Amino acid sequence: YALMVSNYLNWMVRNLADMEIQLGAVKRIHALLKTEAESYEGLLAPSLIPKNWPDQGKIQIQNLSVRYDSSLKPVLKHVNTLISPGQKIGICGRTGSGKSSFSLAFFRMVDMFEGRIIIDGIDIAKLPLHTLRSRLSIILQDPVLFSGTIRFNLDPEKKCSDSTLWEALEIAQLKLVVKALPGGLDAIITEGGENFSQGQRQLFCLARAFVRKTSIFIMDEATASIDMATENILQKVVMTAFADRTVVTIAHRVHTILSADLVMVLKRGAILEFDKPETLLSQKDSVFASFV
Amino acid sequence: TGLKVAKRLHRSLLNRIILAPMRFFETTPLGSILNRFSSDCNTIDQHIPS
Amino acid sequence: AIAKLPIAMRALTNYQRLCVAFDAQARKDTQSPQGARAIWRALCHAFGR
Amino acid sequence: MLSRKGIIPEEYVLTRLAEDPTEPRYRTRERRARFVSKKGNCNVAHKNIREQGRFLQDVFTTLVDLKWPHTLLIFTMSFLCSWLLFAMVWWLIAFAHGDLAPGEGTNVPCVTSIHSFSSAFLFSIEVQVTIGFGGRMVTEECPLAILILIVQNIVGLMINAIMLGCIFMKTAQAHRRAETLIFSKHAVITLRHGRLCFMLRVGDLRKSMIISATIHMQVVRKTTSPEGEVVPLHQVDIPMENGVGGNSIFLVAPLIIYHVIDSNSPLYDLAPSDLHHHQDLEIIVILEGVVETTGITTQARTSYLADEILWGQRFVPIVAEEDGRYSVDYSKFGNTVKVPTPLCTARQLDEDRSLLDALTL
Amino acid sequence: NKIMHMSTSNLSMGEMTAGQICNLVAIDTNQLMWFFFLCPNLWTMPVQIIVGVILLYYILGVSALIGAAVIILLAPVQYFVATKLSQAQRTTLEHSNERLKQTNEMLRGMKLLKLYAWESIFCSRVEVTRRKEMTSLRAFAVYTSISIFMNTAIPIAAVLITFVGHVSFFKESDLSPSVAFASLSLFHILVTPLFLLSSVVRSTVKALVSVQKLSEFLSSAEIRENFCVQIIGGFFTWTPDGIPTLSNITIRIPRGQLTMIVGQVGCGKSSLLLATLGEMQKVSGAVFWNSNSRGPVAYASQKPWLLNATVEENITFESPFNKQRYKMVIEACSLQPDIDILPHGDQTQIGERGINLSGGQRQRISVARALYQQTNVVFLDDPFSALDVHLSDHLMQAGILELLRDDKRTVVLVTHKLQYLPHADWIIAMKDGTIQREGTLKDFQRSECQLF
Numbered sequence A: 001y002a003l004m005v006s007n008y009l010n011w012m013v014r015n016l017a018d019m020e021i022q023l024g025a026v027k028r029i030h031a032l033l034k035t036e037a038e039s040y041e042g043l044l045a046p047s048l049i050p051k052n053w054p055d056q057g058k059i060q061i062q063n064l065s066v067r068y069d070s071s072l073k074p075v076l077k078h079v080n081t082l083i084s085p086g087q088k089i090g091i092c093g094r095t096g097s098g099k100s101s102f103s104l105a106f107f108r109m110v111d112m113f114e115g116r117i118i119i120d121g122i123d124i125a126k127l128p129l130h131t132l133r134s135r136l137s138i139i140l141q142d143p144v145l146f147s148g149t150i151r152f153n154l155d156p157e158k159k160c161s162d163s164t165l166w167e168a169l170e171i172a173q174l175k176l177v178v179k180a181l182p183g184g185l186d187a188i189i190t191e192g193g194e195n196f197s198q199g200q201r202q203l204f205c206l207a208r209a210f211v212r213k214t215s216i217f218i219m220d221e222a223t224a225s226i227d228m229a230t231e232n233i234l235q236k237v238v239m240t241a242f243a244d245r246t247v248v249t250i251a252h253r254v255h256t257i258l259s260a261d262l263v264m265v266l267k268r269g270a271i272l273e274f275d276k277p278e279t280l281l282s283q284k285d286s287v288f289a290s291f292v
Numbered sequence B: 001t002g003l004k005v006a007k008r009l010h011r012s013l014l015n016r017i018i019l020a021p022m023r024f025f026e027t028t029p030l031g032s033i034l035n036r037f038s039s040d041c042n043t044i045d046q047h048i049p050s
Numbered sequence C: 001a002i003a004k005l006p007i008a009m010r011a012l013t014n015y016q017r018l019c020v021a022f023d024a025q026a027r028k029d030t031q032s033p034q035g036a037r038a039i040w041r042a043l044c045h046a047f048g049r
Numbered sequence D: 001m002l003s004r005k006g007i008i009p010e011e012y013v014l015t016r017l018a019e020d021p022t023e024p025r026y027r028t029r030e031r032r033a034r035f036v037s038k039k040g041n042c043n044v045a046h047k048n049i050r051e052q053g054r055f056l057q058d059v060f061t062t063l064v065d066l067k068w069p070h071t072l073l074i075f076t077m078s079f080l081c082s083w084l085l086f087a088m089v090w091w092l093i094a095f096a097h098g099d100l101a102p103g104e105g106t107n108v109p110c111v112t113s114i115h116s117f118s119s120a121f122l123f124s125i126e127v128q129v130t131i132g133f134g135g136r137m138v139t140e141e142c143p144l145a146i147l148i149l150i151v152q153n154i155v156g157l158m159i160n161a162i163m164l165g166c167i168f169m170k171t172a173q174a175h176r177r178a179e180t181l182i183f184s185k186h187a188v189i190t191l192r193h194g195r196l197c198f199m200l201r202v203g204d205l206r207k208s209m210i211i212s213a214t215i216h217m218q219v220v221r222k223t224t225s226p227e228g229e230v231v232p233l234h235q236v237d238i239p240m241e242n243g244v245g246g247n248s249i250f251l252v253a254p255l256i257i258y259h260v261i262d263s264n265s266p267l268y269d270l271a272p273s274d275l276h277h278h279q280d281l282e283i284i285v286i287l288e289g290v291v292e293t294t295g296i297t298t299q300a301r302t303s304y305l306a307d308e309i310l311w312g313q314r315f316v317p318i319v320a321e322e323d324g325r326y327s328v329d330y331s332k333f334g335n336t337v338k339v340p341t342p343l344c345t346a347r348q349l350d351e352d353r354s355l356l357d358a359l360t361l
Numbered sequence E: 001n002k003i004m005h006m007s008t009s010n011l012s013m014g015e016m017t018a019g020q021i022c023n024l025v026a027i028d029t030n031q032l033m034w035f036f037f038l039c040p041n042l043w044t045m046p047v048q049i050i051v052g053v054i055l056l057y058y059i060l061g062v063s064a065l066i067g068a069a070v071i072i073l074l075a076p077v078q079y080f081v082a083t084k085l086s087q088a089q090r091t092t093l094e095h096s097n098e099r100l101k102q103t104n105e106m107l108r109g110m111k112l113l114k115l116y117a118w119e120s121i122f123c124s125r126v127e128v129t130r131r132k133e134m135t136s137l138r139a140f141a142v143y144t145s146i147s148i149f150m151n152t153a154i155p156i157a158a159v160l161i162t163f164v165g166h167v168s169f170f171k172e173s174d175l176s177p178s179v180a181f182a183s184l185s186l187f188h189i190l191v192t193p194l195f196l197l198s199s200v201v202r203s204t205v206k207a208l209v210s211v212q213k214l215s216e217f218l219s220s221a222e223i224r225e226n227f228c229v230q231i232i233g234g235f236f237t238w239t240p241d242g243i244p245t246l247s248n249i250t251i252r253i254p255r256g257q258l259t260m261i262v263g264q265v266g267c268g269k270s271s272l273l274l275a276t277l278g279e280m281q282k283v284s285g286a287v288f289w290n291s292n293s294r295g296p297v298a299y300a301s302q303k304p305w306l307l308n309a310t311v312e313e314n315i316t317f318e319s320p321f322n323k324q325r326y327k328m329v330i331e332a333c334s335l336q337p338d339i340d341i342l343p344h345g346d347q348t349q350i351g352e353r354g355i356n357l358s359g360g361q362r363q364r365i366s367v368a369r370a371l372y373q374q375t376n377v378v379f380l381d382d383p384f385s386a387l388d389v390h391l392s393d394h395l396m397q398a399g400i401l402e403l404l405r406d407d408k409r410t411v412v413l414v415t416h417k418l419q420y421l422p423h424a425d426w427i428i429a430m431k432d433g434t435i436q437r438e439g440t441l442k443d444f445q446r447s448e449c450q451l452f
Ligand SMILES: CCCCCCCCCCCCCCCCCC(=O)OC[C@H](COP(=O)(O)OC[C@H](N)C(=O)O)OC(=O)CCCCCCCCCCCCCCCCC
Pocket: D056, D057, D059, D078, D081, D082, D085, D155
């Protein structure tokens, strides 16, 4: 036994070192597992008291001021812009001040802000994050795709195929995916969505929105999209406001932003220039020049 | 026991990172999470047992 | 804390020695290609000592 | 055997882009090194010294250098090694003659009373230490014993002479006296006679005067030339503004040492913000002069970093006058009472003064 | 070194993609290194086991031979278990990479996955992926448990069989402690190499495979090898013997001559640039390349090459820093509006395994790195298709002309930008792999067939 005491000590120390390194890995794992989401919560009885799905979609901005760190500065400050139910109000004011903040405030990306909001006549801060985003649609600013069923790419939960998706395809101009792609709806995305279009992002967003039965529609700017894609997207926004009876958008290019039913200017967290008729927007040269 | 640790820790980490705020991710280095999710999970699932 | 390694272990000198072995075996012998046998005998000839 | 580090030689490249721990950032905050420390003890670490035997040849330099406990180890071990080696020789020779064999005969032993190695060692004590106990005599029997007695006597006298020399040069050391000279923990800048100067205070504690004192003063700073010649430690000498023109000083009271900042002085472009905590700058003050008693020249090294220089303060007047003789209150040694002064540079001050004088005249 | 001297035909790069060569350089070299680590084992452990067995017989007798025989018989079985373990480990590795790629795709787009309330879909997908990976992990864990079991339970079985056989099947000695404890010590010093000689053989097989892979990599066609570009025939090929790329090409370009070129839909635009570059096997041609032996040809291509580093490093390209040329290049490409919101501007982790960028942004990166070096020639290639910012196009064209043409920095812009479709210098029009003439534009208008 004295003969073997030697390598016993050696390997004990060595395997201790390896155990130490791998336990540091466990320590970092628990560092991740010590992050708790504050926003996710439930405070009301949802069995019968809330409506099954919001229909009116009322909107009001009760001076909502959003601060993530709650110490440095806010992004919105005492904003009160009334979006007319059935009439879009998308304003490209200070780009990094109002549009990102509003989209984040509706959809729980900013669920902690001084002041509140009434969503369809009901305060939004008394509902779960997933419920708050359950009956509402939005698009992105940049494209992202990956391998997976197109049917679940549009409607993972509801999964209403061919009745809506083909109709959702109809508004889209994706003629190739029906035949040029291997299977189409039953086939998954190929090569991580690097072979279809830059309009595939907008088409998928529109397909999800129409398959969400959008009580409210939210849009965003463009990164690099085909002109035909822009025309189809804007026309289908009009048609979605025609049928689903709601639309709302946002943009950053001056002329494209002017291609809207209503618009205003919101700068430095507050309101800069608001006119209910769109004619006054053309009347104001300086405000129009502000964007570009 | 190593197998049990692997399964339960992985599913718990998935669940928690799902129910997480995306403001943190915009603050997170976006590769630190990927590291401690691939390399560290591999270590505890393939080396801590042995 | 650790620093540049000694002369003998520097990759430049090791690469030089391995090239010497490859060139010497490919020149004194007549084997233009470098097959598995050639690389194997080259490593042995350069690191047998 | 029992490890699993050799079973799997593969790797995974999925995990990457791991960085920014922020741990090394705190390490960079460690304070930079000082040239000479406050209590002398210059903080320079020579590297790649090629010894070439110049660190054993000067043996008698080393023997004086060493500490007293080490010097006593060498002392004791020199004597004892000599005693024991010559005891071995006495034992062996008195054994060869047979005087160790008990009751050998009437043959007269070549050294009497050698009846052991123990008595042989005692005999070496008696011979070398020159004690001569009557029991152990040296008889006229064998010539080798007389030769070895001569050799041991000469070697013992030489070893005594060498140890006397080293004890002489060690009991007259200086580093026990260099520490009894006192500087300020921090030096001050202030205007005297309308001109900016860099004051300082130095004093003596022992009553024993320090003769022919001498105060060199240098600035240590990395500095380049117009030709790109970069010197990491470009020491520059500085006059002591002493009226006579020499730098000698008569040190009894705590004196104020300062260099007037004229156009020559390399401190001619200092600003109160230009001498902050981490600024690269250091003043050295070499205080030389012999000790009156032993007549051994000494130095009192000391330094003053940037974060010790303090603008616009004057040393508290330390000397008072008691009933019959003066008084020195060493508690007020390094106290620097605040004194307002212009906060501009030495060049800006000089140019402004010249312009104002020209306009007035 | 043989990466440098290597050729870039589609017979090479279309088979051993960057994934293959990275796997080689890492895995193959690692396992060859491991074989050179374990080499003394395959020489010694034969002697070790043989001498141990022989003097185990001397110490005790036949019974020791029987115990050693049991261990040796179970050696092939443990090799089978370990090899099956390795197969399961490779299966688990493949499934782990699948799951990791899936989680990269998922966690990347957390913005639209959380806003659109779509955690459930990819949660289920990852759940099912982990189910399959868990089955593979179960097999791996079972096999490695058997390996642990055999490793720590063969010495006891060997000792048990030895002593019981000695007592009953032999009944020869009293088994005095001097024999029993010597034998147990021998069993320790024999079980350690006996259980591991199998692994040494395994690494020998793997090393032979690695040298096969390295030799195959080393057995591919690699080395193709006054007025700047003086060409006579110019007929080069991709395949080292045959498959021609072009024919009947000839130019003679003095310095500063912004000899822009034209083309068709993937018809001899970048191929012409590459055949000039010297990476194509020149069959029917004679070129005397000489300077006012080559020069530092600035260059780019359709898909920009980038360094996975910070943006500053990715632009400077291992060269000094000079603020005048730096500012001029980063404005003529307008680099500041492009890097506006990247988390630290220049200091961002551009490149793969990190920041993902768009075609136009990467296009600015490539053109900046190409121009900045302050060299005598520049071969830009199609920087105006993905990056089609009209204002930036005019800015880049103004910068290109004024800077490049003045200092004699030839800028051969082989692209299809209309705003200067008629170049400010020599032009040459290529179509379907034939390019008529490389002279002035007056004779080109004289031909008058390619009217806009
Ligand atoms: C171009 C011309 C060049 C010169 C040519 C000269 C030609 C001469 C011919 C040869 C004769 C030389 C005889 C020397 C043999 C012994 C040398 C020796 O022990 O000292 C060696 C060293 C240093 O001295 P060196 O390097 O020789 O110097 C001479 C030369 N000129 C030089 O400076 O390079 O010495 C030391 O490094 C001594 C260390 C002292 C430490 C004190 C303890 C001593 C230990 C012994 C006693 C310990 C105490 C115990 C007592 C026991 C009693 C036995």
